[PDB]
Write a protein that binds this ligand. Sequence first.
Ligand code: XRU
Length: 212
Amino acid sequence: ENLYFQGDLIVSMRILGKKRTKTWHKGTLIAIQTVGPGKKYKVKFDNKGKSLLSGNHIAYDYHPPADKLYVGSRVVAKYKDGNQVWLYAGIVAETPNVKNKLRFLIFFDDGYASYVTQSELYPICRPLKKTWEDIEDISCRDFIEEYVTAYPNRPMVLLKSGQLIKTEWEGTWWKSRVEEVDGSLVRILFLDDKRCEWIYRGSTRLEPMFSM
Ligand SMILES: CCN(CC)CCNC(=O)c1cc(NC(=O)N2CC[C@H](N(CC)CC)C2)ccc1Cl
């Protein structure tokens, strides 16, 4: 059956859709198609392509009120590294409080983390009941299930700017320096290639966490 309405979705609404690159892109909802007890959502992307997508692979083109977002909420967020932006899927790890300077902490599906504002967050339209169950990487999937279900029980390691530690990359340990602390995140400089990454202080990418 072709529908025009399904829950709070309406054909012709602006939407975000997931592409095979795992990045999300602006489009229009052009059809809703019931297949058994299941629904599929046809997206015409603004730039290139049309996709028939499951409800967990579309996101609203508007920002969710903070009162609707919990630890474990399934979102698309802007990830910024200061020479590239992505719209990428993740999980809300913290909601705004005085300690995080009123920001949302996002754990992205690829294991990277960022603080973002509400204007950088888009709720996924039909998430799974267990929101982590559509994360591709088994390791990121298991870590999110543990973090979300055990929250607010959160082991983190305490680190100071200048501190010299081992940080993981591609399954080995690398010499690195703690540059900066910003709430539950630490900026690590890899001394080998002078590349910086923001890492969650509870991540076992940090050798002090991996052994704690
Ligand atoms: C949700 C966000 N997603 C969206 C997909 C992107 C996250 N970001 C990256 O994935 C990214 C990470 C690197 N990091 C490195 O290449 N390295 C770190 C140090 C390491 N070297 C090797 C000699 C020393 C140990 C190399 C580079 C570029 C990108 Cl874009």
